Structures are given as C-alpha cells and as structure tokens.
Amino acid sequence: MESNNGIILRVAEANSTDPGMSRVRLDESSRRLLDAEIGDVVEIEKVRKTVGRVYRARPEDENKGIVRIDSVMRNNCGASIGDKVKVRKVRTEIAKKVTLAPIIRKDQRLKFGEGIEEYVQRALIRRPMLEQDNISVPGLTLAGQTGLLFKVVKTLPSKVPVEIGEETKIEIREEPASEVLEEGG
C-alpha cells in the first residue's frame, strides 16, 4: 500500500448519454478535500478496484459526497446505485505491460492470432488501465451466454490508473469464458 487517499461516498447514476464511463463529476469539496485538481486521475474501489478521471459536478453542492458514473463504471466494480465506494486520487502513466481475459468463446472475437495481442492494444490503446478492472464490447454476444466483457488481471504500472499506448505490451490468457463459472468456493 504505497499510497491510499480517497473518500467514501455513494455511487450515483441516472438516464443520460452512454459515455461518461471515464469521467467523475464531483464538487469542489469532494475533489479539493484531498488534492484532486481539475483533470487529475481518480481511482475508485467499491467491490473491486476501478479507475477514472475527475470532473466538475453540474451542481457544485450535491456532489459533496456522491459520484455520478455510467452503468459501465458501476459494472466495472460490481456496486449498485447509492452503494458505498472509496475513490482515491492518483495520477496516470503509460502502462508498459498489461494482461487481460476477454470472456467469450474461442470462436467469438479472439480468433485472429498473429498480432492479436497488438490488436487488443490497437483497440484499447490510449486508455486508463487497472488490473482486475473490466470493459464492455460493442453490443456483441451469442446464445443465452453471460459475461462477454474484458477482465484485466495484471498491470505493470504501480496498480494505479495508467493510459495504454501503442508501445504498451499486452498479454492474453488462453482460458476465456470456457468452463469458468466460479465453481470453486
């Protein structure tokens, strides 16, 4: 635990545009209570670890203990509206090596090979990454299956929000959503 500074507030969310899964709207006190300035990098942790950026709340008075995020950011950690998550301020860097595990069938999206690891970088390039985070796919799926999302498991940075680049290295695991259902435990 090299550094741990954030606040405990409740995840917010309402009908709106699909984007906003990478921006946090908060108030001066929620962001200034620690040090977060405009456009600093913020990390979130309700059920899992999450990353995001700081934004100015429209209502500079209600956002003194609530964070408005998209359903995807809520899906990234696994919390419900009004839950309790801890958001800690951090900074961004260029991830040099990140591993992830797209949950699909061997014949869904990972049937390319040769440069497929770079293909993940090509799509995810210039993006904030956090081991154990999760991502969404352009509305794709098959029968009545579940998951169909990318789950990151390892990162090279200091486990802090980093932004991917074409030079970032990636790792893809050979055990996608095959026979995986948390049978253990």
From Swiss-Prot:
Lineage of source species: Archaea, Methanobacteriati, Thermoplasmatota, Thermoplasmata, Thermoplasmatales
Quaternary context: Homohexamer. Forms a ring-shaped particle.
Keywords: ATP-binding, Nucleotide-binding, Repeat
Section of the entire sequence shown: 1 to 183 of 745
Protein name (record): VCP-like ATPase
Keyword ATP-binding part of the UniProt annotation: yes
Gene Ontology CC, one term: intracellular membrane-bounded organelle
Presence of keyword Cytoplasm: no
Gene Ontology MF: a single term: ATP binding
